[PDB]
Design a protein around this ligand. Structure first.
Ligand SMILES: *[C@@H]1O[C@H](CO)[C@@H](O[C@@H]2O[C@H](CO)[C@@H](O[C@@H]3O[C@H](CO)[C@@H](O)[C@H](O)[C@@H]3O)[C@H](O)[C@H]2NC(C)=O)[C@H](O)[C@H]1NC(C)=O
Ligand SMILES: [Ca+2]
Ligand SMILES: [Ca+2]
Ligand SMILES: [Zn+2]
Lengths: 389, 207
């Protein structure tokens, strides 16, 4: 099977060219490949991890909606950014969406988001958890523009991703081709499933909790798009291509410069909306990421190398610790608790060899040892505990 | 529909981290048994159920979730999560269990609470949901109902009777009203007694 797509790690059409990729599934994570559910083989964007289709009406139907079919399993369809209307490359859009979501399923699987951990797969292959819950992947969904969204019911019910066309440019830009947005959406499924356990999807719904929900989503998109040549001084924006907006869609770029991005824990005291709060959390996580990369290096391969279950590099280590922290923390956690959960994840995974790197990053942005949660009067701290460094 | 940000749940769980877990402790084994014993030690008066989603992570840490109950109902926002280390001891834990006076089962036995259809109407009207509710309710497999005759939802809305810990710390008897309208997929906690007040709204849809 061939997929003509922007390869994993290319955030948007401005950052690479499309290539033809053969059988891009992970043999462990996708036992039946991406185009089977174990019982049926498909010649389309349908299989164990997701079912992708157009949805021009914006309605709730999906099973019998349009998707391209190829008997030779050659999913190579025309695309150029200068094409109009978006519907003229709906095939390419559906395939790019399907590819990105399936690669992410596979990567998350490798990092521990398996069947028993509440993942999204139709057939659990007896591995635990609840099936019948692949991700519904709607390309060019007609229910909106200039956005995207993701529904995360409890384990056993499908996740539902709706991707929109953006209209802030001529021609319109199809979100299916911004990997970052697809990853942002899918990460809502990850964080909601892991937090409070697979059975409970109520657990990132409080204001500060849902804020972190947004932060984890931006963070994973950002970590994944890291490339050869990136440095601590490299900044990243969110949804800059799709939105046609300088600086992207968040208040500041993700940056290790406090002058470029001044956000700290107490910034949350003045925020009322989850995306703005998310930016603060993702900024803290960006500092963690770079401290871990400085110490352990960065693996530019699309899948980690694991040594006794531990990623060998700082990039995949950061992702792993973030996931493991989601599984440790309480339902509807605050920043301080989620931080402690990340620190405890490192204790459980490595015996605590990264406590200094993690603590220093959080302290840098005011979530140090003395930080205190409050609805309206959070206390910031730049303290790192005695003798961790 | 109204601005749902005003109806978000609270974030007042506690997380007892790995360091504090050792500190607060009293001065092979099954991880579920170890976790259950731990909940009983922390919350000796609580009745609860072990949630059927526990697992051992590829880090070797097991995760067990518990849901508090009262009078045979879930306290829907009262949770306990226990992380059990590979050494078989409790590694860390979180909880939002209710530790106050538990109400009498009288109101339940007497069925002295609102009709689930009244709860659905109160939800629709207060939240200004784009749905039509000249509906009827039908029993399911425990104080759990499905609504028929509703228009504007992706599937039939549902109601389940629960307890709910309000923002003032006290227990409400409430209908949990589920309404999937595609743009939003809501669990609304609406009082089943006093005044039909909405205590919280969960949305499964995130941007
Ligand atoms: C896990 O929870 C523990 C316990 O709450 C946290 O450790 C505690 O951190 C606080 C804040 O730094 C310490 O208090 C402070 O330090 C001294 C008091 O000894 C004083 O200078 C300050 O006024 C303030 O009271 C506290 O001593 C410390 N306890 C221990 C055992 O370390 C810990 O940081 C949390 N996080 C993680 C990931 O472990
Ligand atoms: Ca599942
Ligand atoms: Ca969950
Ligand atoms: Zn989001």
């Amino acid at each position: 099977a061939d997929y003509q797509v922007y390869a994993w790690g290319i955030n948007d059409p401005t950052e690479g060219e499309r290539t033809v990729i053969k059988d891009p599934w992970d043999s462990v994570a996708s036992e039946f490949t991406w185009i089977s559910d174990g019982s049926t083989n498909y010649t389309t964007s349908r299989g164990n991890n997701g079912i992708a289709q157009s949805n021009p009406s914006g309605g709730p139907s999906y099973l019998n909606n349009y998707r391209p079919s190829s008997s030779s399993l050659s999913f190579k369809y025309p695309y150029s950014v200068s094409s109009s209307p978006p519907s003229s490359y709906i095939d390419a859009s559906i395939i790019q969406l399907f590819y990105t979501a399936n690669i992410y399923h596979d990567l998350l699987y490798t990092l521990g988001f398996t069947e028993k951990a509440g993942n999204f797969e139709y057939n659990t292959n007896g591995q635990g958890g609840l099936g019948n819950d692949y991700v519904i992947l709607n390309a060019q969904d007609g229910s909106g523009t200039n956005n995207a969204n993701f529904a995360t019911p409890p384990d056993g019910q499908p996740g539902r991703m709706r991707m929109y066309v953006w209209t802030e440019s001529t021609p319109y830009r199809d979100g299916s081709f911004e990997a970052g947005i697809v990853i942002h959406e899918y990460t809502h499924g990850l964080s909601n499933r892991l937090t409070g356990g697979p059975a409970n999807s109520n657990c990132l719904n409080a204001l500060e909790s849902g804020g972190m929900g947004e932060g984890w989503s931006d963070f994973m998109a950002t970590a994944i798009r890291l490339k050869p040549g990136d440095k601590r001084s490299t900044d990243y924006t969110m949804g800059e291509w799709a939105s046609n907006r300088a600086g992207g869609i968040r208040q500041y770029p993700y940056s290790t410069s406090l002058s470029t991005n001044p956000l700290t824990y107490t910034s949350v005291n003045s925020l009322n909306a989850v995306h703005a709060i998310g930016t603060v959390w993702a900024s803290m996580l960006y500092e963690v990421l770079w401290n871990l990369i400085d110490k352990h290096g960065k693996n530019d391969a699309p899948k980690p190398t694991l040594r006794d279950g531990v990623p060998t590099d700082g990039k995949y280590l950061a992702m792993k610790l973030v996931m493991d922290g989601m599984a440790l923390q309480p339902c509807n956690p605050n920043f301080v608790q989620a931080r402690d959960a990340i620190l405890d994840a490192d204790t459980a995974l490595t015996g605590g060899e990264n406590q200094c790197e993690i603590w220093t990053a959080f302290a840098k942005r005011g979530l140090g040892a003395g930080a205190k949660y409050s609805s309206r009067n959070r206390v910031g701290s730049t303290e790192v505990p005695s003798g961790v460094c | 529909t109204v601005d749902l940000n005003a109806f978000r749940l609270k974030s007042l769980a506690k997380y007892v981290n790995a360091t504090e877990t050792v500190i607060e402790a009293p001065s092979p084994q099954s991880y579920v048994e170890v976790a259950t014993q731990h909940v009983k030690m922390i919350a000796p008066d609580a009745t609860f159920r072990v949630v059927d989603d526990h697992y051992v992570g590829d880090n070797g840490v097991a995760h067990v979730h518990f849901r508090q109950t009262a009078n045979g109902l879930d306290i829907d926002n009262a949770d306990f999560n226990v992380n059990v280390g590979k050494d078989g001891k409790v590694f860390s834990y979180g909880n939002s269990f209710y530790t106050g006076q538990i109400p009498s089962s009288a109101a339940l036995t007497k069925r002295d609470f609102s009709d689930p259809v009244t709860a659905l109407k109160g939800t629709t009207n207060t939240l200004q949901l784009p749905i039509t509710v000249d509906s009827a309710s039908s029993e399911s497999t425990k104080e759990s109902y499905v609504f028929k005759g509703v228009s504007g939802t992706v599937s039939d809305p549902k109601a389940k009777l629960v307890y709910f810990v309000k923002d003032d710390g006290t227990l409400a008897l409430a209908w949990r009203v589920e309404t999937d309208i595609d743009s939003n997929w809501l669990l609304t906690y609406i009082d089943a007694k006093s005044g039909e007040e909405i205590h919280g709204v969960v949305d499964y849809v995130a941007e």
